[PDB]
């Protein structure tokens, strides 16, 4: 979908990656960036992805690299 | 050299009034002009709704006619240039000069 010259990631979430790797793993990180591309330096962390009203924690897995964080947060409740 | 005057206006009966005043002045002062040529009129067409609500079928049909006139002057005689450059023309006529 996106062009190959640079996978997109927000600046506020990229700063949250830097402190989490150095200072060790923490509580699940609340964010709103549903459009960021998962990089390999995030594997192991838990990021709470906002889905419209709440935050769902997503345990990052090795095969999640390349996809979006919005692909792990259902936006509507179905019954 | 050669100077040309591109004339454009919204009215067809008004664009030839300002055109004839230039050509008659040019022939009187001794200039060589190959007449005025009728260029094709670029007419726009506007079709918009008349109602702000339902009954889509009733509409309005507008147009804007922009006629074009070109006068080619062969010789840059100083008597020709000084008269034509500050003529009193109609307000609805836009002039374009190529020196």
């Amino acid at each position: 979908r996106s062009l190959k010259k640079g996978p997109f990631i927000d600046l506020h979430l990229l700063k949250k990656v830097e402190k989490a790797v150095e200072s060790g793993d923490k509580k699940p990180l609340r964010t709103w960036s549903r459009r960021s591309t998962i990089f390999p330096n995030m594997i192991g962390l838990t990021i709470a992805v906002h889905n419209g009203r709440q935050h769902v924690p997503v345990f990052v897995t090795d095969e999640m690299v390349g996809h979006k964080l919005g692909e792990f947060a259902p936006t509507r409740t179905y019954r | 050299q050669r100077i040309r005057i591109r004339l454009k206006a919204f009215d067809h009966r008004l664009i030839d009034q300002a055109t004839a005043e230039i050509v008659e002045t040019a022939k009187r002062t001794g200039a060589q002009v190959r007449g005025p040529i009728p260029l094709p009129t670029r007419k726009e067409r506007f079709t918009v709704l008349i109602s702000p609500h339902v009954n889509k079928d009733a509409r309005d049909q507008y147009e804007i006619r922009t006629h074009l006139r070109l006068v080619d002057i062969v010789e840059p005689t100083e008597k020709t240039v000084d008269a034509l450059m500050r003529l009193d023309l109609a307000a609805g006529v836009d002039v374009q000069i190529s020196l």
Partner: protein
């Protein structure tokens, strides 16, 4: 001596240049068989030169712009009839009888408001 006649159609425009003596047809620097892909379009220009006999008797030098297959062919057919009336001036009674000198002025009907086409209305419900 040149003999000229203007014939046109919907969006075509054809000139006709007559010169005395050949069976030559040159359309847009091409031949009659080369330019016309349709066999019907080859024969509709032969229709005005049917009552008046041409075999190898007069040149025709024609060009045409705009239109299509039969739009150009109808433009040539009108242009030849005005050239023969220029050529002889007594042939008119045969040309009025054929019906070829009448300019077909059936232009396209405009696309109307509220309809997808000139007369075709979008589909209608009873109730």
């Amino acid at each position: 001596n040149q003999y000229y006649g203007t014939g046109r159609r919907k969006s075509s425009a054809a000139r006709v240049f007559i010169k005395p003596g050949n069976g030559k047809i040159v359309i847009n620097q091409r031949s009659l068989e080369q330019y016309f892909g349709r066999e019907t379009a080859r024969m509709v220009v032969r229709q005005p030169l049917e009552l008046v006999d041409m075999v190898e008797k007069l040149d025709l030098y024609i060009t045409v712009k705009g239109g299509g297959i039969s739009g150009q062919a109808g433009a040539i057919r009108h242009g030849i009839t005005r050239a023969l009336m220029e050529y002889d001036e007594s042939l008119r009674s045969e040309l009025r009888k054929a019906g070829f000198v009448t300019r077909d002025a059936r232009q396209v009907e405009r696309k109307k408001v509220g309809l997808r086409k000139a007369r075709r209305r979008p589909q209608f419900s009873k109730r």
